[PDB]
Scaffold this active site. Structure first.
Site, PDB file in Angstrom:
ATOM      1  N   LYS A 189     -58.322  63.236 -60.014  1.00 32.31           N
ATOM      2  CA  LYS A 189     -58.497  61.954 -60.673  1.00 32.31           C
ATOM      3  C   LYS A 189     -59.024  62.160 -62.097  1.00 32.31           C
ATOM      4  CE  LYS A 189     -57.295  59.499 -57.094  1.00 32.31           C
ATOM      5  NZ  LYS A 189     -56.132  58.551 -57.094  1.00 32.31           N
ATOM      6  N   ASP A 211     -54.168  61.904 -62.013  1.00 33.05           N
ATOM      7  CA  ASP A 211     -53.941  60.510 -61.620  1.00 33.05           C
ATOM      8  C   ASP A 211     -54.966  59.624 -62.332  1.00 33.05           C
ATOM      9  OD1 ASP A 211     -53.509  58.044 -60.369  1.00 33.05           O
ATOM     10  OD2 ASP A 211     -53.589  58.869 -58.325  1.00 33.05           O
ATOM     11  N   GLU A 258     -50.008  60.569 -63.135  1.00 32.01           N
ATOM     12  CA  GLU A 258     -49.693  59.504 -62.192  1.00 32.01           C
ATOM     13  C   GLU A 258     -50.345  58.190 -62.607  1.00 32.01           C
ATOM     14  OE1 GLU A 258     -50.198  60.478 -58.101  1.00 32.01           O
ATOM     15  OE2 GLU A 258     -50.797  58.447 -57.488  1.00 32.01           O
ATOM     16  N   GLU A 305     -47.398  53.865 -56.063  1.00 29.73           N
ATOM     17  CA  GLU A 305     -48.217  53.545 -54.895  1.00 29.73           C
ATOM     18  C   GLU A 305     -48.520  52.050 -54.786  1.00 29.73           C
ATOM     19  OE1 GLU A 305     -51.450  56.092 -56.118  1.00 29.73           O
ATOM     20  OE2 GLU A 305     -52.868  54.443 -55.816  1.00 29.73           O
ATOM     21  N   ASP A 321     -45.185  53.894 -51.239  1.00 26.83           N
ATOM     22  CA  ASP A 321     -46.296  53.783 -50.315  1.00 26.83           C
ATOM     23  C   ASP A 321     -45.766  53.182 -49.028  1.00 26.83           C
ATOM     24  OD1 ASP A 321     -49.555  53.504 -49.988  1.00 26.83           O
ATOM     25  OD2 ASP A 321     -48.476  51.831 -49.064  1.00 26.83           O
ATOM     26  N   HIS A 329     -47.319  58.362 -51.668  1.00 26.49           N
ATOM     27  CA  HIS A 329     -48.768  58.154 -51.720  1.00 26.49           C
ATOM     28  C   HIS A 329     -49.364  58.252 -50.325  1.00 26.49           C
ATOM     29  CE1 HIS A 329     -52.299  55.208 -51.785  1.00 26.49           C
ATOM     30  NE2 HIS A 329     -52.669  56.168 -52.611  1.00 26.49           N
TER      31      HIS A 329
HETATM   32 MG   LIG Z   1     -52.591  57.575 -57.102  1.00 29.00          MG
END
Ligand SMILES: [Mg+2]
Ligand SMILES: [Mg+2]
Lengths: 421, 421
Positions: free
Chosen positions: B217, B245, B271, B298, B321, B348
C-alpha cells in the site's frame, strides 16, 4: 446553530394507479421520497429528500441514517465557512465510501442530506436557495465545491475564471428572472402507459398552455412509437419542439436504428438511449443519430462520470438531477464543467419534489454560471405538487422564481403521516 | 429444489485491532460480510456474502432483503435452465434498479445473492463451483451471461467463438490445475499501518514462502512510501516483483508525479491510482507513468464500466472483484471481454472470504476462457480463513484447486453467532 438530530420518512405515492411516470424501463413507478429532517435547537429545520420509484426506498433510508452519524453534532457555521470541506466530510467516511463511492444508495442519501443542509442554511438567512447562492461572490461559490477527481478536466482556478466572467451581469439577470421566470418543457403528455386518446388530449393541453417543448417516452415497441409520435405531431403542430426519452433500454446499435426510424418526427434529441454508465456508448449513438442530439444524465452517478460524458463529447445536452448525486454542491460542479464546454444543462424533474429542487438549480446556473436561459428548458411534470408547502409555480411554459426561504422541498405535515410506507 | 426462504447476518470482524487491511483511503477497516443463506426444502443451503469494511454493511443487508422478494419462491431448475434469464430477473426489478442501476448497495447485494445461488447449485451436484462451470459446454457457459449493455464490444456470437476456441484444451488445463494450482501474490506484508520492523519480517516471510509477486500500500505520505519500498526491495530481493496500490486517493496529475517518484522500486503496476469511475483519467495516468502498468477494478461497479476501461485501453491489468458486481455471471462476462482484448485478469482478494471466492473464478478463466495462468496472479491475503468450513489453501505461491462441493464461502456456525453486529 447546531444540527442536533435527524428524522427519516419512507414516503411512497401511488402514481402507478394511473401509470403516471410510466416509461420503457419503469412500467409502474410509485413515486417515492426518502425524506430527511435535520433538527436544530433553533426555529428552523432542514428538510430534504432523495427520489426513488418505490421498492428500494428503504435502502436509501438506511443510507441516510448511516450518514446521520457524520452530520448530527455539527455546527452550521462550520458547514457554511467552507461547504466544500463539509462535502468532503459527509462523503468521506471511508467505510461508507465502500458502499459506493459516490454512487447508488449511499450517494442518493448524500443528495438528501446535503440538500437538507442547504434548506436549513437558506431558511436561516431568509432567502430562497437560488438567491442564497446567486448573491455569493465567485470565490464564495467556488468554496462550495469539492473538486476531488475533477481537476484534470476542471481545476479550481479555471472554475473561478468562469465564475468571475459571469459576475458582472448578475443583477440584470436576477431582475430578468423575476420578470420572465425560467422556461420549461413538459413530459406530462408523454408517459408510455397512456392510451392514444389520452395522449391526444394531453398534447392539446400542453400546446394550449403555451409550452414550446414537449417530451414523449419511447422504446418499448417501435410500432407504438411511430404511431404515437405521428399522432403527437398532428395535435402539437409543426412548430412544437418534440423530444423523446428511451429510459436506457437499448443497445448501441439498436438505439441508432430505432431513433433513425423516428427521425420523421423531428425530435430535438433522444434522451438516455442506453445505460447511464456508458459514456463511449452514448458517443457512438450520438455520431450515428446526428443531427438528432443526445441527452443523458438523470441517473449519471457523480461528477466523475459527468466530466467524462462532457469532456469526451458523448452528449449535446447535460441533464443533471437534483438528488441523484451529492446535492447542490456536486450539481454546481457539473454545471461549471458544462459551461467550460459550452454544453447546455436541462435538469431532470421526473419525480416527486424534483421540480421544486431543480428550479433553484437552473436559476443559479442562469444568474451566476452561464448567464443564459432562453435556449434551455428545465423539465417539468404536473404531479404531486399539492404535497409541498411552497410548490413550484409554472404558467405559460415557465417556472416563476421561488420566493420562500429554503429549497422549496418541505412537505405539508399531513403528507408526512399519510404517505408513510 | 425450491428456494423457500432467506436469512441474513450482519457480520463484522475487528480487523482494525492490528490495522490489517489498512491503506491510504481506508485507514482502519473492519472487515465485514453482509452474509446471506438461501433456504431450500432439501439438505443444502446456498451461502453467499458481499464484502464491506464496517459501517454501511447494514445498508447491504437491507438491499439483500429487498432482493429476497425476487428470489424466494424460485425453483432451482428454472434458474439452472437459463441463469442469464435469472440474472436479468434479479437485477431487473425497475424500482430496485432506480437505487443503482447495477452499482452501489443494490449491486453488492446482488453479488451476495447471485453467488449464494451458485453455492447451492454446486452443492446440489457435488462439485466445487469452478468445476461445475468448467464442465459446461461453451453454449451452456454462454447461457449464464446477461449481455445487456455489452453488445457494442462483445456480443453473444463473439463470446461463443471465444468459448468454443478454449474448449479443446480444457481437459489438459484441468489436469495442469490439479498438478500446479493457480499462482497468487500476497498483499499481507503491505498494509499501510504496519511498523517498519513488521514490514521487514513479513517481507522475509513472503520471500521464503516462494511468492514471486508482493504488493504494498502507498499513497498517504510520499516519504513513507519511499522508505517502505526501499526497505521492501532490500528484504524481498532483486528477483521479487513489487506492486503498489494507492486505493484511489490521487488526482491524475498527482498520481503521475507520485508513482514516477517511486520508479526506483520498479513497481510492476500502480493499482487504483485514482477514482474507480475515471476511465479517461486512468488512461491519462497510464500514459504518464509508462512503463509502469496501471491496474484497477476492485470497485469497478459493473460490466459496463469494465467494458469501457478495457476497450479504451485505460488499464493493463483487470482486477475483477467476486462480489462487488452481480456475482459470478457478471465476472465471467468481464473475463470474456478481457479475453477479447487479451488483457489479463488478476482478481482482488483483500477482504473476508474474497480469496475463497476468487480462486474459483480465475480457475474458470484458466480452464474455459483464456487458457493461460502462468503469467497471472490472483491476489491473496492471509486473514480470517479460520472462519470458513473449506478455506482456500495456498502454498509455494499458488492456490490449490478447491475440491469440496460449493463456492468455498460457507462459514462455520460459531462464526455466524460470534460475529453478529
Ligand atoms: Mg486494491
Ligand atoms: Mg428521462
Amino acid at each position: 446553530t447546531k444540527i442536533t438530530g435527524l428524522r427519516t420518512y419512507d414516503l411512497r405515492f401511488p402514481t402507478s394507479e394511473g401509470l403516471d411516470g410510466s416509461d420503457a424501463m419503469n412500467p409502474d413507478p410509485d413515486y417515492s421520497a426518502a425524506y430527511v429532517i435535520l433538527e436544530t435547537e433553533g426555529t428552523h429545520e432542514g428538510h430534504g429528500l432523495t427520489f426513488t420509484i418505490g421498492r428500494g426506498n428503504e435502502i436509501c433510508i438506511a443510507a441516510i441514517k448511516a450518514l446521520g452519524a457524520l452530520v448530527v453534532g455539527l455546527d452550521l457555521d462550520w458547514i457554511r465557512e467552507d461547504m466544500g470541506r463539509f462535502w468532503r466530510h459527509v462523503t468521506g467516511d471511508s467505510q461508507l465510501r465502500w458502499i459506493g463511492p459516490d454512487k447508488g444508495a449511499i450517494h442518493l442519501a448524500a443528495g438528501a442530506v446535503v440538500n437538507a443542509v442547504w434548506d436549513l442554511w437558506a431558511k436561516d438567512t431568509g432567502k430562497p436557495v437560488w438567491r442564497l447562492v446567486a448573491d455569493m461572490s465567485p470565490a464564495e461559490i467556488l468554496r462550495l465545491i469539492d473538486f476531488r477527481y475533477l481537476t484534470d478536466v476542471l481545476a479550481p482556478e479555471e472554475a473561478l475564471d468562469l465564475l468571475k466572467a459571469a459576475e458582472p451581469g448578475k443583477e440584470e439577470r436576477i431582475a430578468r428572472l423575476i420578470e420572465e421566470g425560467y422556461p420549461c418543457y413538459t413530459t406530462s403528455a408523454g408517459w408510455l402507459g397512456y392510451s392514444d386518446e389520452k395522449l391526444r388530449r394531453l398534447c392539446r393541453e400542453a400546446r394550449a398552455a403555451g409550452f414550446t417543448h414537449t417530451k414523449f417516452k419511447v422504446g418499448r415497441d417501435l410500432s407504438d412509437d411511430i404511431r404515437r409520435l405521428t399522432i403527437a405531431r398532428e395535435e402539437l403542430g409543426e412548430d412544437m419542439n418534440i423530444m423523446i426519452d428511451a429510459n436506457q433500454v437499448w443497445e448501441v446499435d439498436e438505439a441508432i436504428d430505432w431513433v433513425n426510424r423516428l427521425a420523421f418526427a423531428r425530435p430535438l434529441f433522444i434522451e438516455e438511449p442506453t445505460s447511464p454508465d456508458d459514456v463511449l456508448g452514448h458517443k457512438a449513438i450520438r455520431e450515428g443519430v446526428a443531427p438528432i442530439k443526445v441527452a443523458t444524465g438523470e441517473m449519471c452517478q457523480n461528477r466523475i462520470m459527468f466530466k467524462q460524458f462532457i469532456a469526451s463529447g458523448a452528449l449535446d445536452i447535460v441533464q443533471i438531477d437534483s438528488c441523484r448525486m451529492g446535492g447542490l454542491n456536486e450539481v454546481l460542479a457539473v454545471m461549471l464543467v458544462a459551461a467550460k464546454y459550452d454544453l447546455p444543462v436541462w435538469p431532470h424533474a421526473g419525480g416527486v419534489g424534483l421540480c421544486e429542487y431543480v428550479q433553484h438549480m437552473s436559476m443559479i446556473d442562469y444568474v451566476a454560471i452561464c448567464g443564459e436561459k432562453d435556449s434551455k428548458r428545465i423539465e417539468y411534470v404536473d404531479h404531486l405538487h399539492e404535497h409541498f408547502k411552497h410548490p413550484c409555480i409554472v404558467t405559460g411554459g415557465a417556472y416563476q422564481a421561488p420566493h420562500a426561504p429554503g429549497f422549496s422541498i418541505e412537505m405539508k405535515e399531513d403528507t408526512l403521516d399519510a404517505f408513510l410506507f
